[PDB]
């Protein structure tokens, strides 16, 4: 497989591949870092802007991963419940059947919502480890 | 037993004073406006729709507006918009040739215009036609006897003339800080601007700032909250000027107010001269009104104020500016596209223990921020111009007499372009976070 | 409460927030990033200098995190000794009373001292933890 | 021992010293925010460009590091056996005797292969991982 | 090596254009010499000594 060949996946089978999408996230800076000494100077500033907000968009997906209890792994578990309030669907037939495309239109309304509840689930969590390690 | 472990917290809440390059924001709706028009219109990233404040509680924090960055990347930023305003506009260079003159031809009440004549190129390089315009008094000198003239700048640059689509009107401009940076305001109405203010609220962007231009009274800016303010940094030198800010406004009126026509002579190939063609009326001297009954009264509260500083039987009185160019003697501001100077000697001699009508002067060729080589010719404005506006407040010089000391003499100051906008950046402060650091506690890492 | 609202708190209440700081240090990146066409470019330069500014100040502080034990946590105990000489308060006072602010200057001088010690007992901690998996 | 100070030793003693390379990574940046106000703005151009490159490494480095086991350890043990192919150097002569410049030539080749078998021992672990969690 | 004009020579200004002047070469104010430079002829013959070795 290539880059974002499991697109049209059901969801289940794409989960084995997210290191595709991760790697190709940032290191496509390839293409801009290739390479005139300073005139035509505009050209060298529509790359270069674009060079910062690709490094922004990956730092940013990292930072909010790393307020979680998540930073450095492709798949996590945690520790907040499914309100099926942000999805009625069972859990077979998402794993099943749907494709990642599919499924981030179905649960889109909510995401704002979820971040929040990990957010705060973590923090307390590691003020009650800390409350541990006071005596361990 | 307690024994101590050091143990680190990150998104500490605390931060240290910095400079910063802050950046600008503009009004979403004039965002709309065609570019380049007055103040980076197009160029300036839009507002966010809140400025998004929160009281900080218990927190008191150092205040100091003479020392405050924060005014120099503003001056700085305004020198460089007016510069990048004007390097697409025609530079004047061909009308710096000699002036046939005569005095001005229907009624006047003194002969301040000039009517002069001279050889100006046509588009075809090989054909230049004899024409025609008015020009104030100032804006030409006599090389001589005979009478040949040229224009007062000819001898040390060549102008641009300002393009006539661009307006100079001092839109609103919030300042924002960058993250890992933010703004504090202090909130204390009896703030002085220097010391510990003990209600602060971070923001991430300023209010709406606007770029006005005058010397002797501050026109348009913020009110005081509940009486006249009067600041300094240090009282008892002379050479730094007070600053004073009214609670209430005081309105003044502006006006030209003759009928003035434009007229376009084609120098070159795609570049046109807006010379000064005639005027349709009599002519009457530019002038400002203010009321009276408010003057009087607001000195009142300003006297109330110095009484404080300078103690309560003191002798205070005002007096007009001393001597000097037009353009430090002067209340020296832009009306409408238009440059007025006017003669401030009509307010300023009090002493203490209807409307005020001030005449004006006018110039076509200007240099504000006084470089050596860059000047704008401003081009005339058609028809009769007038505004109306709020002193804000006003900049004082405390004369240094070795005198009797029962008595102190205040002179309306001319100051530096800065107080324009000092007048707003005294409330606010820039700080960098520091959101890293360590403390005990009795906890061990796990091995 | 809002962003730096707990700055006025003792230390003690204000270890709950820290999820707020740390985001808005660099997600405000949100007003820059919002917004002609290339003229007045010197505007763009003003922005892009803050840019790479605000992403470098990040970047260092998960640097230095990282080379002590605590990459992508907001809390962490450690195992270095609160020498009394940092600071003769008891552990009491300062979580109880003092502001954030105020610690910060009274432990300034000997904070670049504090770093060296985390660092060093950190990386002999993770090659002692080589020479025990090399057998475990 | 200064910055790359110990870069002729035996790889052996060179590995208590890796936090010495680490830190001027990134930091070293410290020289060119140090800077006029506009004009001669391509010697702006000139740091700006090198800095966006030297944070464009670090975080490619980082990245790399963190689609393995190892983000934010600077020693890791993993599980991918060696082949002897990579190198018939015997354990001992290798820690003992070469330099760290030494080995990067004598390995030089294969490094291509090794990176690619620690990822997908990875991302396949990660699964194995929640497979577990699912039922506990 | 030392070397000199070494002439007494003047600047002038002409003032071509509004803000724009141009530097003259006005007049020579003593009588005029060649320049020159001198370098020490023993240093040199040894050093062209130590070259060749
Ligand atoms: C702050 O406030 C003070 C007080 O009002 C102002 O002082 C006045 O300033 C004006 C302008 O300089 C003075 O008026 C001028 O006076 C000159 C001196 O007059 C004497 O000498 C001449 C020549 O020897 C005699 O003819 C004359 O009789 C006096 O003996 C005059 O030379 C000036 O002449 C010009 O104006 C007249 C106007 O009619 C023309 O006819 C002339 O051709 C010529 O253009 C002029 O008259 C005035 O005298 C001052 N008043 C006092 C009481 O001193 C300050 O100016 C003010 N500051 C500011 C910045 O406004
Ligand atoms: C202190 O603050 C006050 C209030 O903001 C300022 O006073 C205003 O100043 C602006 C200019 O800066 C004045 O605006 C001008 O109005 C002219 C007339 O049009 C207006 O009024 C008529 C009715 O009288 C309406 O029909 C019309 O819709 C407008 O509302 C315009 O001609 C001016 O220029 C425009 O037209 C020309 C010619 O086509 C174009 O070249 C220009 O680009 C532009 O489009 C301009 O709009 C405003 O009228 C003033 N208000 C008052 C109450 O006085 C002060 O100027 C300010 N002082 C300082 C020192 O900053
Ligand atoms: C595009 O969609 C198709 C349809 O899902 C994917 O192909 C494979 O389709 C079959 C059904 O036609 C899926 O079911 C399984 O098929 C095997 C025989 O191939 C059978 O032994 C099992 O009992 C089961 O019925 C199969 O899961 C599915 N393949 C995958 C990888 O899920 C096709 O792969 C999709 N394309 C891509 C690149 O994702
Ligand atoms: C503007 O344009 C006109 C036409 O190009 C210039 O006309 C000048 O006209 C006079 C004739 O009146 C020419 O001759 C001189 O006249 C005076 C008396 O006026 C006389 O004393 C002299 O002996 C001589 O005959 C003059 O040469 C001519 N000028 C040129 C440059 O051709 C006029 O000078 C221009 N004015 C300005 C201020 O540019
Ligand atoms: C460029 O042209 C101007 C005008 O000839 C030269 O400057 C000076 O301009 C003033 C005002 O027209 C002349 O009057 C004197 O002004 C002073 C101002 O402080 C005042 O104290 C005196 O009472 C008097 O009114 C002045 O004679 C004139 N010339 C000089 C030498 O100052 C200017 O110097 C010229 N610059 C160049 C580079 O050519
Ligand atoms: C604006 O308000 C602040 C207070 O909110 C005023 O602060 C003044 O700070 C000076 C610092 O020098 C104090 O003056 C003297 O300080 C020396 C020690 O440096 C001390 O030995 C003297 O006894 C004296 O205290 C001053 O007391 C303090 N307060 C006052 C009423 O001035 C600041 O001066 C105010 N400025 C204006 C223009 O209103
Ligand atoms: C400033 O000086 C000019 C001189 O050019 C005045 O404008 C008018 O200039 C024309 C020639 O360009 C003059 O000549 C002719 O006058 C007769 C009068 O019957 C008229 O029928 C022609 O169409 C032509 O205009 C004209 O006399 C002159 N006008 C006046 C009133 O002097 C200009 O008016 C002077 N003053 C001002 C305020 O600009
Ligand atoms: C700014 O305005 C003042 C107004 O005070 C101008 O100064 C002079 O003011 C006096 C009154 O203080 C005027 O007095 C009159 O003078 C004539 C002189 O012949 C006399 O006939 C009258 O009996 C009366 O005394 C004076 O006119 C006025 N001077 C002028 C030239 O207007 C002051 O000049 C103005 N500022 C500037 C820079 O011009
Ligand atoms: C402040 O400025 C005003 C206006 O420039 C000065 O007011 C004028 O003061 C004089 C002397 O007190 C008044 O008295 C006399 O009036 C007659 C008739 O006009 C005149 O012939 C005398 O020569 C003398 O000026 C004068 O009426 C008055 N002018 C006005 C328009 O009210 C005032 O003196 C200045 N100083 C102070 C301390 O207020
Ligand atoms: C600004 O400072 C005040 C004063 O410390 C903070 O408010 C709260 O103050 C009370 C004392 O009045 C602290 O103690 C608690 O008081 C209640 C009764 O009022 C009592 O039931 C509790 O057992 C306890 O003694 C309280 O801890 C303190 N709040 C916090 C969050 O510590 C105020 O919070 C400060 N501002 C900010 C933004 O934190
Ligand atoms: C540059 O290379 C030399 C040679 O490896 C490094 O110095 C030290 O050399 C000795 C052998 O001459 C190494 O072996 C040990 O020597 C001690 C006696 O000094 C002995 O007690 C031990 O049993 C063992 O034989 C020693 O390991 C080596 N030092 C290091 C740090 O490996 C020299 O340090 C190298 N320079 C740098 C900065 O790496
Ligand atoms: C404008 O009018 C004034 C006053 O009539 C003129 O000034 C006088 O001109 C004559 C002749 O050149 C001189 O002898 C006088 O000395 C001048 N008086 C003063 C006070 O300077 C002036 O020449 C006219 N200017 C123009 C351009 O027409
Ligand atoms: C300014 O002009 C307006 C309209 O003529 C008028 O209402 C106002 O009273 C004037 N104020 C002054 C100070 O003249
Ligand atoms: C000056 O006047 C004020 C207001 O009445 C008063 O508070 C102050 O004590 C007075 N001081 C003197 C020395 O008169
Ligand atoms: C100026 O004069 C012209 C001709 O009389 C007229 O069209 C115009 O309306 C006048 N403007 C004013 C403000 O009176
Ligand atoms: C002048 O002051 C009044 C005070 O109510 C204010 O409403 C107005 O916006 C101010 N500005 C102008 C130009 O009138
Ligand atoms: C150069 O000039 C200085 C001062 O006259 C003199 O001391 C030096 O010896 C000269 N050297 C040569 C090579 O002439």
């Known amino acids: ?136 | 037993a307690e024994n101590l472990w050091v143990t680190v917290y990150y998104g500490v809440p605390v931060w240290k004073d910095a400079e910063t390059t802050l950046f600008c924001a503009s009004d979403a709706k004039a965002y709309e406006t065609e570019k380049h028009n007055v103040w980076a219109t197009h160029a300036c990233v839009p507002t966010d729709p809140n400025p998004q404040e929160i009281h900080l509680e218990n927190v008191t924090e150092e205040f100091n507006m003479w020392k405050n960055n924060m005014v120099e990347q503003m001056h700085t930023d305004i020198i460089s918009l007016w510069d990048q305003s004007l390097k697409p506009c025609v530079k004047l260079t061909p009308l710096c040739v000699t002036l046939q003159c005569t005095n001005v031809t229907n009624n006047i009440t003194r002969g301040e215009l000039k009517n002069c004549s001279f050889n100006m190129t046509t588009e075809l390089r090989d054909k230049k036609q004899k024409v025609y315009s008015l020009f104030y008094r100032l804006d030409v000198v006599q090389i001589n006897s005979n009478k040949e003239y040229r224009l007062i700048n000819c001898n040390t640059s060549a102008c641009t003339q300002a393009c006539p689509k661009v307006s100079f009107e001092p839109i609103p401009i919030h300042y924002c800080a960058p993250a890992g940076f933010a703004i504090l305001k202090c909130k204390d109405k009896k703030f002085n601007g220097t010391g510990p203010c003990p209600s602060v609220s971070t923001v991430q962007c300023t209010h709406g700032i606007k770029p006005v231009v005058s010397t002797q009274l501050l026109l348009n800016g913020s009110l005081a909250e509940e009486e006249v303010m009067i600041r300094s940094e240090n009282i008892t030198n002379n050479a730094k000027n007070i600053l004073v800010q009214f609670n209430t406004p005081v309105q003044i009126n502006c006006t030209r107010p003759n009928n003035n026509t434009r007229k376009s002579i084609r120098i070159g190939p795609g570049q046109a001269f807006y010379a000064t063609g005639d005027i349709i009326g009599d002519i009457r001297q530019a002038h400002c009104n203010v009321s009276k009954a408010t003057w009087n009264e607001t000195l009142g509260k300003v006297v109330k104020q110095l009484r404080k500083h300078f103690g309560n039987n003191t002798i205070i009185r005002f007096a007009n500016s001393s001597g000097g160019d037009l353009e430090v003697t002067t209340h020296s501001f832009n009306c409408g596209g238009e440059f007025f100077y006017c003669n401030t000697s009509g307010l300023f001699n009090s002493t203490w223990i209807d409307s005020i009508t001030l005449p004006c002067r006018i110039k076509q060729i200007i240099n504000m921020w006084q470089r050596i080589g860059q000047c704008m010719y401003a081009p005339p404005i058609q028809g009769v111009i007038r505004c109306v506006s709020n002193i804000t407040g006003l900049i004082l010089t405390r004369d240094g007499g070795s005198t009797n000391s029962t008595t102190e003499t205040f002179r309306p100051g001319g100051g530096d372009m800065r107080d324009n906008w000092r007048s707003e950046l005294y409330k606010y402060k820039v700080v960098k976070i520091e959101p890293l650091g360590v403390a005990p506690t009795r906890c061990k890492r796990r091995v």
């Open chain 1, 1 to 136: 497989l290539g880059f974002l060949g499991a697109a049209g996946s059901t969801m289940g089978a794409a989960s084995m591949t997210l290191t595709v999408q991760a790697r190709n996230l940032l290191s496509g800076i390839v293409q801009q870092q290739s390479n005139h000494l300073l005139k035509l100077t505009v050209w060298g500033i529509k790359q270069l802007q674009a060079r910062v907000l690709a490094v922004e968009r990956y730092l940013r997906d990292q930072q909010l991963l790393g307020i979680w209890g998540c930073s450095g792994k492709l798949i996590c578990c945690t520790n907040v419940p499914w309100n099926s309030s942000w999805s009625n669907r069972n859990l077979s037939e998402i794993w099943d059947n749907m494709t990642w495309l599919q499924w981030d239109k179905e649960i889109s309304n909510y995401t704002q919502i979820i971040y929040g509840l990990l957010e705060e689930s973590q923090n307390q969590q590691e003020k009650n480890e800390q409350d541990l390690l006071a005596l361990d």
